[PDB]
JSON list of C-alpha atoms in Angstrom, two decimals:
[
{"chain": "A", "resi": 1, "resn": "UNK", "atom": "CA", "xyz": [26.25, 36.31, -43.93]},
{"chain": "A", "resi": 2, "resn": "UNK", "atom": "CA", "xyz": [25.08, 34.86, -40.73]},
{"chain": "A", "resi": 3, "resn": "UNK", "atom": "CA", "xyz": [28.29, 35.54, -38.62]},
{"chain": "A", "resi": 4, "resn": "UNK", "atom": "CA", "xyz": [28.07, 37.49, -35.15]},
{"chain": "A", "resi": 5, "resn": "UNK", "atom": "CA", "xyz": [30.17, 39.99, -36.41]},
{"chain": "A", "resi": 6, "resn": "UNK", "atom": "CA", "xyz": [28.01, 41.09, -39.74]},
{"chain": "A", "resi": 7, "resn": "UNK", "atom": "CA", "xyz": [27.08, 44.64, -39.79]},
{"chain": "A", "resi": 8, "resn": "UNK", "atom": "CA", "xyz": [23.52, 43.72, -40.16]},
{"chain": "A", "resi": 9, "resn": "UNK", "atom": "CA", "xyz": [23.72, 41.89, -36.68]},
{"chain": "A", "resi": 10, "resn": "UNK", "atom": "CA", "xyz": [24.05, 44.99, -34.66]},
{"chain": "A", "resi": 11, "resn": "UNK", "atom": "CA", "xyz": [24.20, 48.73, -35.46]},
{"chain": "A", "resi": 12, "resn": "UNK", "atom": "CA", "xyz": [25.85, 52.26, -33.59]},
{"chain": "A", "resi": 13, "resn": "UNK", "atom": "CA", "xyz": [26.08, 53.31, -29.83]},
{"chain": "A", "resi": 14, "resn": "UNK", "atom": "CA", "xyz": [25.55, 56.39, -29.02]},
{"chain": "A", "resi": 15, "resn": "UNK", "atom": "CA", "xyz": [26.96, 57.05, -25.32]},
{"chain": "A", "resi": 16, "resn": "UNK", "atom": "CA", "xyz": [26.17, 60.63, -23.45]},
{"chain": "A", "resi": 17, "resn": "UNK", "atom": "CA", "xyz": [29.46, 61.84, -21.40]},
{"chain": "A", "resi": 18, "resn": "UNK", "atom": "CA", "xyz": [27.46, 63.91, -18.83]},
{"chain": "A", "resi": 19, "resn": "UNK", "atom": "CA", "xyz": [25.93, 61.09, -16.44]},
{"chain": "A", "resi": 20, "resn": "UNK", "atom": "CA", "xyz": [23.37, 61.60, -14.46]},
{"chain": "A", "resi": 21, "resn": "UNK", "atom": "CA", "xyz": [22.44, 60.30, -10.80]},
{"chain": "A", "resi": 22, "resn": "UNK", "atom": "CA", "xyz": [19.51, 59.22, -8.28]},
{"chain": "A", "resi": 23, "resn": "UNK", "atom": "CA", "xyz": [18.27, 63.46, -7.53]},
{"chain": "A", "resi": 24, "resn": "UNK", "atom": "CA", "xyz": [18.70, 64.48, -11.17]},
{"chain": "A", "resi": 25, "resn": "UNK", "atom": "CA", "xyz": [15.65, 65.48, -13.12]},
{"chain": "A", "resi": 26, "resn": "UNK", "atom": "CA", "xyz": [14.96, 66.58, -16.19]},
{"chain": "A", "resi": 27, "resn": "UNK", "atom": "CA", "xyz": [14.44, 70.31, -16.22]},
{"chain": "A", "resi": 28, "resn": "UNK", "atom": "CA", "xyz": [11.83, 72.89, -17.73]},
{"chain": "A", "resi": 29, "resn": "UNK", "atom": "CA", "xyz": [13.32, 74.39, -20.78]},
{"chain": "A", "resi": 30, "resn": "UNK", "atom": "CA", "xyz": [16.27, 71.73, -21.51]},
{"chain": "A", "resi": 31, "resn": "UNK", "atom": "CA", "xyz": [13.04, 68.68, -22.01]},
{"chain": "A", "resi": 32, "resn": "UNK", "atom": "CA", "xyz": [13.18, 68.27, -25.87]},
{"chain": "A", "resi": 33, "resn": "UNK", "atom": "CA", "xyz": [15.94, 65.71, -27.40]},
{"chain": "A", "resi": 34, "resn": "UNK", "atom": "CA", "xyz": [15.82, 65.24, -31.33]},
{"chain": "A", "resi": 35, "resn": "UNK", "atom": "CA", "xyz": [17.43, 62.48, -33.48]},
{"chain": "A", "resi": 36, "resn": "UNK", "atom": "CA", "xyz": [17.83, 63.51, -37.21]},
{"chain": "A", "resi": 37, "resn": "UNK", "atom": "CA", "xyz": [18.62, 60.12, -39.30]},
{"chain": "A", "resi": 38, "resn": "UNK", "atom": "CA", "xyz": [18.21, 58.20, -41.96]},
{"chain": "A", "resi": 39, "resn": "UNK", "atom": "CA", "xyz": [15.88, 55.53, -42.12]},
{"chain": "A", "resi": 40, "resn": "UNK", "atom": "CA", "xyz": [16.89, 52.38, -43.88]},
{"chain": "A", "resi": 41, "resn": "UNK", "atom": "CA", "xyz": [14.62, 52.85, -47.11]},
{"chain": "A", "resi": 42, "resn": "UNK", "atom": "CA", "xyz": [16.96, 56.58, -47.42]},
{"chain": "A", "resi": 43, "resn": "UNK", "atom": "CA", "xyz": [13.96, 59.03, -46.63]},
{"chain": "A", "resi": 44, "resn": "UNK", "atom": "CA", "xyz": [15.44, 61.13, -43.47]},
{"chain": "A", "resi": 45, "resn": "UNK", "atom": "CA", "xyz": [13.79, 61.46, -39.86]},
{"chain": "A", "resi": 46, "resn": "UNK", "atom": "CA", "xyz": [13.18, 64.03, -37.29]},
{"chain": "A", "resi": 47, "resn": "UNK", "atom": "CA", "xyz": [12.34, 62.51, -34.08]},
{"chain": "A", "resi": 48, "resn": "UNK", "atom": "CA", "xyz": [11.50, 64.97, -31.73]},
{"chain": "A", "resi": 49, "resn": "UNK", "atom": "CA", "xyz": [11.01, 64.27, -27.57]},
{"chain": "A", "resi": 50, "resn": "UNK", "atom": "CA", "xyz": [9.62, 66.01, -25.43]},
{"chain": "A", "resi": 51, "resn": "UNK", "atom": "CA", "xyz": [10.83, 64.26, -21.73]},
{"chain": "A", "resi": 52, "resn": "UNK", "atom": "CA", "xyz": [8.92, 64.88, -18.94]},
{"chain": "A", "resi": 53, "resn": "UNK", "atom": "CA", "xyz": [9.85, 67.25, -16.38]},
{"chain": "A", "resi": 54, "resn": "UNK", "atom": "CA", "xyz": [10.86, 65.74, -13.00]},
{"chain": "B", "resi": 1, "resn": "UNK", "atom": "CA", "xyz": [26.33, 57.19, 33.68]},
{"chain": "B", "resi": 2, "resn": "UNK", "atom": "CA", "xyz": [29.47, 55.71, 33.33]},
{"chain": "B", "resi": 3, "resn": "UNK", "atom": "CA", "xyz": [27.57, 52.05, 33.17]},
{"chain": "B", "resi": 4, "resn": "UNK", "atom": "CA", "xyz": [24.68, 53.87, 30.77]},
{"chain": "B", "resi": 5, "resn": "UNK", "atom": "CA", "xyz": [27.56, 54.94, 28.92]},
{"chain": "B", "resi": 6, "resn": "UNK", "atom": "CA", "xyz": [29.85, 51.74, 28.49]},
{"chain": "B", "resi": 7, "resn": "UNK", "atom": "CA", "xyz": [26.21, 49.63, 27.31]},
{"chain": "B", "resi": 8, "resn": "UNK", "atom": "CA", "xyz": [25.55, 52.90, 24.97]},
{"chain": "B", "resi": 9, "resn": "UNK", "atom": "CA", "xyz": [29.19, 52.15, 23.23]},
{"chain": "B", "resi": 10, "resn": "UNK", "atom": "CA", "xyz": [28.11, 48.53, 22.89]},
{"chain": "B", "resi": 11, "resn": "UNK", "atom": "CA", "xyz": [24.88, 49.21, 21.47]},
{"chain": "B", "resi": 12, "resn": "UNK", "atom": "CA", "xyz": [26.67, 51.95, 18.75]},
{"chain": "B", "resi": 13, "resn": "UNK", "atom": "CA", "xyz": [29.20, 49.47, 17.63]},
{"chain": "B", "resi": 14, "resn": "UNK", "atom": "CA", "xyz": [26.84, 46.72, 17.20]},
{"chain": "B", "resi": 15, "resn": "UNK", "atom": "CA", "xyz": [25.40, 49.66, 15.09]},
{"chain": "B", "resi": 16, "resn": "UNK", "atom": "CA", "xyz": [27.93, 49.61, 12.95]},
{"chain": "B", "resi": 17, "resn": "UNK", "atom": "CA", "xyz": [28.48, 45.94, 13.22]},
{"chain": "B", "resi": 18, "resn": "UNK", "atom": "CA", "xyz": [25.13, 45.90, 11.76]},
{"chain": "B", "resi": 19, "resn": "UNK", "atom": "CA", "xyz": [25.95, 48.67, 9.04]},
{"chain": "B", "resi": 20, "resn": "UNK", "atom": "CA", "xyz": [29.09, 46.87, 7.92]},
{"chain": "B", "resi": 21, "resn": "UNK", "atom": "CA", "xyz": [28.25, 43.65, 7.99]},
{"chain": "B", "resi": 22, "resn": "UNK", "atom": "CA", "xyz": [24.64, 43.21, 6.19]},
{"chain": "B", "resi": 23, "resn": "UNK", "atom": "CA", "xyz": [25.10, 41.71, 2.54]},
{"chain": "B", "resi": 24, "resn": "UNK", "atom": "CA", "xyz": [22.86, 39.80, -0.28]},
{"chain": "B", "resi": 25, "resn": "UNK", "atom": "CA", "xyz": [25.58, 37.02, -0.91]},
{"chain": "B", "resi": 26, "resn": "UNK", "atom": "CA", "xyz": [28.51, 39.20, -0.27]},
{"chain": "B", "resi": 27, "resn": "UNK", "atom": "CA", "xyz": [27.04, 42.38, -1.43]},
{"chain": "B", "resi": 28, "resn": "UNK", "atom": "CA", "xyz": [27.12, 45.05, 0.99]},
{"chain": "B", "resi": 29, "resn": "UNK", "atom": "CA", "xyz": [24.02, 47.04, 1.53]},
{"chain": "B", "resi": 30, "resn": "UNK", "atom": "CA", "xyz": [23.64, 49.73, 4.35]},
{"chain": "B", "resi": 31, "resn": "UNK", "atom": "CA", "xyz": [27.81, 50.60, 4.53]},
{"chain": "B", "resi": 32, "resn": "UNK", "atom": "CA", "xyz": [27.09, 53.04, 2.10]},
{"chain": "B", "resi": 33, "resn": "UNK", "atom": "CA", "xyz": [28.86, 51.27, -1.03]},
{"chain": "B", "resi": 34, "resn": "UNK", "atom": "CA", "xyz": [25.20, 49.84, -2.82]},
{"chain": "B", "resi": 35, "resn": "UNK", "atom": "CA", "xyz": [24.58, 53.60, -3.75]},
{"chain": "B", "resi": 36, "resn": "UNK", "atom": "CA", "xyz": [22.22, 53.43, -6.90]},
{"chain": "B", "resi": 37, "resn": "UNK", "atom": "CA", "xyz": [21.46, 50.07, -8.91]},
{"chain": "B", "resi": 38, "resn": "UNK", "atom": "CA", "xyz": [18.88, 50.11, -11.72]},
{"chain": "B", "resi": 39, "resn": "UNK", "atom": "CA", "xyz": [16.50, 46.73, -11.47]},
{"chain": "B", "resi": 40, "resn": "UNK", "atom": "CA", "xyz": [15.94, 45.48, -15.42]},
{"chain": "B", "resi": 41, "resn": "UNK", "atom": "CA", "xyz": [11.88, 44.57, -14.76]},
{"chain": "B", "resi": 42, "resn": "UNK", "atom": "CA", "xyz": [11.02, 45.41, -18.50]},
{"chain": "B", "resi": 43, "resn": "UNK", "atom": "CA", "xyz": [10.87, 43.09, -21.26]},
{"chain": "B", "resi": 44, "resn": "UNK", "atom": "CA", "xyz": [12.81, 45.45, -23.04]},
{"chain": "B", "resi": 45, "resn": "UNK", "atom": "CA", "xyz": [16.32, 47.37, -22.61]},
{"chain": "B", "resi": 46, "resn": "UNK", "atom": "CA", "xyz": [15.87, 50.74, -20.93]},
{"chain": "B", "resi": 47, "resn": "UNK", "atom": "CA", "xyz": [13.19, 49.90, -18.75]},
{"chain": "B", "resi": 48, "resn": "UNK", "atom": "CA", "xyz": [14.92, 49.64, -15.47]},
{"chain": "B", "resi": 49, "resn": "UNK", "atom": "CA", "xyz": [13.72, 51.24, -12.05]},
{"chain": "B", "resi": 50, "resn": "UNK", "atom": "CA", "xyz": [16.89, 52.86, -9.16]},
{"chain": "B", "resi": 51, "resn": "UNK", "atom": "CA", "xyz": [16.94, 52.16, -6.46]},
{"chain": "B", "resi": 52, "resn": "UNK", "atom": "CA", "xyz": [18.91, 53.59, -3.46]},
{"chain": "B", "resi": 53, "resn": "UNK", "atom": "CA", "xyz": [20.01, 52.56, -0.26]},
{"chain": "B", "resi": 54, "resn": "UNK", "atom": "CA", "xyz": [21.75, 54.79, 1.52]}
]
């Protein structure tokens, strides 16, 4: 299926409801964000960041 | 002082005159209601730059 609307033409959102503004910055001790998935083939993930302070 | 004053008045509201009035094609700028807009300059999604005029 070539349509717009096939699943395969897009994917999932993921929106935070805490936004953030111009003088926020990423503090020491809340840095690290992981995303545990599944990858396509089936084999899970564990992406772990580490954002930079500031 | 009176005169000093008067000239003073008319130098603060074309101030404001200034303030209020300065747009990119109709979009206000130094009234206060630009706040923060991210510039797109990547290639990519999420690589956007704020900036802030205040």
């Amino acid at each position: 299926d070539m349509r717009s609307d096939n699943r395969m033409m897009g994917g999932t959102s993921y929106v935070a409801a805490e936004g953030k503004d111009k003088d926020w910055k990423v503090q020491a001790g809340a840095n690290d964000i992981t995303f545990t998935l599944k990858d396509i083939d089936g084999n899970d993930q564990t992406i772990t960041v580490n954002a930079k302070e500031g | 002082r009176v005169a000093i004053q008067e000239e003073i008045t008319a130098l603060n509201d074309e101030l404001n005159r200034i303030a209020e009035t300065t747009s990119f094609g109709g979009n206000k700028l130094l009234n206060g209601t630009f706040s923060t807009k991210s510039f797109q300059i990547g290639a990519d999604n999420g690589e956007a730059v704020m900036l802030t005029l205040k």
